Design a protein around this motif. Sequence first.
Motif, PDB file in Angstrom:
ATOM      1  N   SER B  43      -8.138  21.333   9.351  1.00  0.00           N
ATOM      2  CA  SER B  43      -6.917  22.014   8.940  1.00  0.00           C
ATOM      3  C   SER B  43      -5.758  21.036   8.827  1.00  0.00           C
ATOM      4  O   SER B  43      -5.042  21.018   7.820  1.00  0.00           O
ATOM      5  CB  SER B  43      -6.586  23.130   9.927  1.00  0.00           C
ATOM      6  OG  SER B  43      -6.491  22.622  11.244  1.00  0.00           O
ATOM      7  N   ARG B  44      -5.561  20.203   9.847  1.00  0.00           N
ATOM      8  CA  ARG B  44      -4.468  19.245   9.789  1.00  0.00           C
ATOM      9  C   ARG B  44      -4.726  18.148   8.770  1.00  0.00           C
ATOM     10  O   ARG B  44      -3.772  17.510   8.315  1.00  0.00           O
ATOM     11  CB  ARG B  44      -4.212  18.636  11.167  1.00  0.00           C
ATOM     12  CG  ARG B  44      -4.982  17.366  11.457  1.00  0.00           C
ATOM     13  CD  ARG B  44      -4.722  16.905  12.878  1.00  0.00           C
ATOM     14  NE  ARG B  44      -5.360  15.630  13.178  1.00  0.00           N
ATOM     15  CZ  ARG B  44      -6.481  15.503  13.874  1.00  0.00           C
ATOM     16  NH1 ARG B  44      -7.126  16.558  14.342  1.00  0.00           N
ATOM     17  NH2 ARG B  44      -6.965  14.287  14.108  1.00  0.00           N
ATOM     18  N   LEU B  45      -5.986  17.906   8.402  1.00  0.00           N
ATOM     19  CA  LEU B  45      -6.256  16.998   7.294  1.00  0.00           C
ATOM     20  C   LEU B  45      -5.835  17.614   5.965  1.00  0.00           C
ATOM     21  O   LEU B  45      -5.155  16.974   5.154  1.00  0.00           O
ATOM     22  CB  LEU B  45      -7.738  16.629   7.263  1.00  0.00           C
ATOM     23  CG  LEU B  45      -8.207  16.064   5.924  1.00  0.00           C
ATOM     24  CD1 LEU B  45      -7.637  14.679   5.701  1.00  0.00           C
ATOM     25  CD2 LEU B  45      -9.722  16.042   5.854  1.00  0.00           C
ATOM     26  N   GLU B  47      -3.853  20.195   5.289  1.00  0.00           N
ATOM     27  CA  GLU B  47      -2.496  20.709   5.153  1.00  0.00           C
ATOM     28  C   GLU B  47      -1.522  19.687   4.585  1.00  0.00           C
ATOM     29  O   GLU B  47      -0.408  20.064   4.211  1.00  0.00           O
ATOM     30  CB  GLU B  47      -1.981  21.208   6.501  1.00  0.00           C
ATOM     31  CG  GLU B  47      -2.471  22.593   6.867  1.00  0.00           C
ATOM     32  CD  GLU B  47      -1.830  23.679   6.031  1.00  0.00           C
ATOM     33  OE1 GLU B  47      -0.786  23.410   5.403  1.00  0.00           O
ATOM     34  OE2 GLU B  47      -2.374  24.802   5.994  1.00  0.00           O
ATOM     35  N   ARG B  48      -1.907  18.414   4.509  1.00  0.00           N
ATOM     36  CA  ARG B  48      -1.010  17.404   3.965  1.00  0.00           C
ATOM     37  C   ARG B  48      -0.982  17.413   2.444  1.00  0.00           C
ATOM     38  O   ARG B  48      -0.185  16.681   1.851  1.00  0.00           O
ATOM     39  CB  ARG B  48      -1.409  16.023   4.484  1.00  0.00           C
ATOM     40  CG  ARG B  48      -1.159  15.847   5.972  1.00  0.00           C
ATOM     41  CD  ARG B  48      -1.977  14.713   6.555  1.00  0.00           C
ATOM     42  NE  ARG B  48      -1.466  13.409   6.158  1.00  0.00           N
ATOM     43  CZ  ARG B  48      -1.883  12.259   6.667  1.00  0.00           C
ATOM     44  NH1 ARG B  48      -2.812  12.216   7.606  1.00  0.00           N
ATOM     45  NH2 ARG B  48      -1.353  11.123   6.222  1.00  0.00           N
ATOM     46  N   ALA B  49      -1.827  18.216   1.803  1.00  0.00           N
ATOM     47  CA  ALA B  49      -1.814  18.330   0.352  1.00  0.00           C
ATOM     48  C   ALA B  49      -0.951  19.506  -0.081  1.00  0.00           C
ATOM     49  O   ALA B  49      -1.184  20.646   0.329  1.00  0.00           O
ATOM     50  CB  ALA B  49      -3.234  18.503  -0.182  1.00  0.00           C
ATOM     51  N   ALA B  50       0.043  19.227  -0.921  1.00  0.00           N
ATOM     52  CA  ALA B  50       0.978  20.254  -1.355  1.00  0.00           C
ATOM     53  C   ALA B  50       1.745  19.759  -2.571  1.00  0.00           C
ATOM     54  O   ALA B  50       1.485  18.677  -3.102  1.00  0.00           O
ATOM     55  CB  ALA B  50       1.946  20.640  -0.235  1.00  0.00           C
ATOM     56  N   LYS B  56      12.937  17.187  -2.844  1.00  0.00           N
ATOM     57  CA  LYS B  56      12.157  16.049  -2.380  1.00  0.00           C
ATOM     58  C   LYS B  56      11.516  15.274  -3.522  1.00  0.00           C
ATOM     59  O   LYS B  56      10.762  14.330  -3.271  1.00  0.00           O
ATOM     60  CB  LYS B  56      11.079  16.514  -1.401  1.00  0.00           C
ATOM     61  CG  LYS B  56      11.613  17.191  -0.152  1.00  0.00           C
ATOM     62  CD  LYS B  56      12.466  16.245   0.672  1.00  0.00           C
ATOM     63  CE  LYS B  56      12.946  16.911   1.951  1.00  0.00           C
ATOM     64  NZ  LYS B  56      11.833  17.140   2.912  1.00  0.00           N
TER      65      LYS B  56
END
Lengths: 57, 125
Positions: B43-45, B47-50, B56
């Motif tokens: 999940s934490r891997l 979640e960095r894709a967005a 920004k």
Amino acid sequence: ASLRDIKTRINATKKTSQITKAMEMVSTSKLNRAEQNAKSFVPYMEKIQEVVANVAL
Amino acid sequence: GKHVLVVYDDLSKQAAAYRELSLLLRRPPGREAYPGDIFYLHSRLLERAAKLSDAKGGGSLTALPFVETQAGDISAYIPTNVISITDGQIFLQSDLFFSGVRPAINAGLSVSRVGGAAQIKAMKK
């Protein structure tokens, strides 16, 4: 295989088997009346054959 | 501000390596001998894709993780973990593969929660 797959397969086979049993029952029922219809028709053809075996001349 | 496409060729092998490390370091094993935080890892891997807002910058990063299923048993631990994190899923089947469907996408099961909004106006019709 998986337990879910095996159980679903068993249930599908069960339902198909029950439907085929019902189909066998209804087919036998329809036979139960086709036979008596044929028997009741037999004497008419008997009469027609009796008449035919004089008209030949 | 760039656009990046990232492909992980297999996540099951990463999960197996993490299981090996956790067992060697003597963490208590869970179901299928996996450690507890195997979900927290993926999940934490992912979640960095967005996609970033214009505040920004117009940067964006999309991820295409891969998962290999044993005999098509999707109810397995790692497949069920990964399927509940991503935005969509594409299911490829050997059954469709051999029948003649060269790209073996099972259209019945494949879904995309972001679809429509992504497609162009002509294709959406």
